[PDB]
Amino acid sequence: TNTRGKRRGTRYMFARPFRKHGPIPLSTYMRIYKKGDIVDIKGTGTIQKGMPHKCYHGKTGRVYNVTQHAVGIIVNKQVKGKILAKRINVRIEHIKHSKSRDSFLQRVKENEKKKVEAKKEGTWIELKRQPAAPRPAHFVSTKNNKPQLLEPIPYEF
């Protein structure tokens, strides 16, 4: 069978991108991670301290504890057929702010920006998102765009 090593199979996930080796850019160190914010988990082989396990590389959770160099994350991990809330300690070099909820917070502020206009104008502009509706009826002009006759080309070996 396989080995139960903590880094078995992490040859490529913990490696660094091509021509992106060396020291970690310091902007990643000066990012503030408060409690309850959504962060991604992407382990780096450069910082061998506070590494997340390979099962959390690519997962996303929220921060519950903040320390000097690391952050406590609550991550979901499916073991066999149950999903468990894992509290893992990961240094800030292996995490980053998740832009998943940023699209939601952008829409929340934009929803509150457009409904206060209704209280000042008297409209009911719908705020709900809608799937891609069927294409409406349109006229396709052929003034300077004549339909070109296409034909299947003969076979060439």
Partner 1 sequence: VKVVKNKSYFKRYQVKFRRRREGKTDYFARKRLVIQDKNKYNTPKYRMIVRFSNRDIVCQIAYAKIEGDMIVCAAYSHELPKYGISVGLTNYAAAYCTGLLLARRLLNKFGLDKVYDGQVEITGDEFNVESIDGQPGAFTCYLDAGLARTTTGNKVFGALKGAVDGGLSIPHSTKRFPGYDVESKEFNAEVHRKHILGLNIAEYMRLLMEEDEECYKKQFSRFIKNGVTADSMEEMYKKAHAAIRENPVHEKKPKREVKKKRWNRAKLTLAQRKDRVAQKKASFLRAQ
Partner 2 sequence: AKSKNHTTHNQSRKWHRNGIKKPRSQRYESLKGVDPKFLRNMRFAKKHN
List binders of partner 2 among 72-131 (CB under 8 A). 72, 74, 76, 78, 80-85, 87
Applying the rule CB under 8 A, the residues between 18 and 77 that interact with partner 2 are: 64-67, 72, 74, 76
- Interface pick for RNA out of 3, 68, 141, 142 (rule CB under 7 A): 3
Positive or negative CA dihedral for 56, 59, 65, 68? positive
Applying the rule CB under 8 A, the residues between 16 and 45 that interact with partner 1 are: 19-24, 26-27, 29-34
From partner 2, RNA, partner 1, none, which one binds at residue 92 (CB under 5 to 8 Å depending on kind)?
Answer: partner 1
The yes or no reply on residue 141 touching partner 1 (CB under 8 A) is: no
- Interface pick for partner 1 out of 61, 88, 92, 94 (rule CB under 8 A): 92
- Interface pick for partner 2 out of 1, 27, 142, 145 (rule CB under 8 A): 1
> Is residue 106 a contact partner of residue 96, using CB atoms and an 8 Å limit?
no
Please work out the total of residues on this chain that contact partner 2, with binding judged by CB under 8 A. 16
User: What value, to the nearest 5°, has the Cα angle with vertex 44 and ends 22 and 97?
Assistant: 110
Distance from chain centroid for Cα 12: 20
Largest CA distance in the chain: 71
| Shortest spacing between CB 83 and partner 2, in angstroms | 5
Residue 90, CB half-sphere, CA atoms under 13 Å: how many? 30
Phi-psi region of 114 (alpha: psi -120 to 50; beta: other; left: phi over 0): alpha
For partner 1, the closer of residues 33 and 54 by Cβ is 33
| Shortest spacing between CB 80 and partner 1, in angstroms | 34
Distance from C-alpha of 50 to C-alpha of 93, rounded to nearest angstrom: 9
User: What SS3 class is residue 114?
Assistant: helix
Residues that bind partner 2 (CB under 8 A): 1, 64-67, 72, 74, 76, 78, 80-85, 87
